[PDB]
Design a protein around this ligand. Structure first.
Ligand code: FMN
Length: 109
């Protein structure tokens, strides 16, 4: 299959911290668990990230909807890569959002 990475954000905490990341996520971004867990995913953004697409994810997360955007992201060493990000909300039976899950693909090609 295509090369992707996977994370889980906790939506019971107000700023959606990451609580789990696949090994490829660390290997792709250059960050380790000590710098990823407990933090919001936006640390991967930087100068060239498009604010209009960031705002697309912000709104989908507040509305508890799925969302797919492509973002410029930066590895720990500063170098950029194009991240095709799909976020999916996970609900409890009472309709509340408990977790957000994300598939991240590096589409720099
Ligand atoms: C990030 N992946 C990612 C994965 C999940 C499951 C979630 C919920 C969010 C992300 N983000 C974005 C970030 O957490 C936030 O949702 C947005 O930046 C919008 O909110 P703000 O407050 O910044 O307007 C991811 N962002 C990335 O840049 N790279 C990812 O891999």
């Amino acid at each position: 299959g295509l090369r992707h990475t996977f994370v889980v954000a906790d939506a019971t905490l107000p700023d959606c911290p990451l609580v789990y990341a696949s090994e490829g996520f660390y290997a792709m971004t250059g960050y380790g668990p000590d710098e990823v867990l407990g933090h919001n995913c936006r640390f991967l953004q930087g100068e060239g990230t498009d604010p209009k697409e960031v705002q697309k994810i912000r709104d989908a997360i507040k509305k508890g909807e799925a969302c797919s955007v492509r973002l410029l992201n930066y590895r720990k060493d500063g170098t950029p890569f194009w991240n095709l990000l799909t976020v999916t909300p996970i609900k409890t039976p009472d309709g509340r959002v408990s977790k957000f899950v994300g598939v991240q693909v590096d589409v720099t090609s």
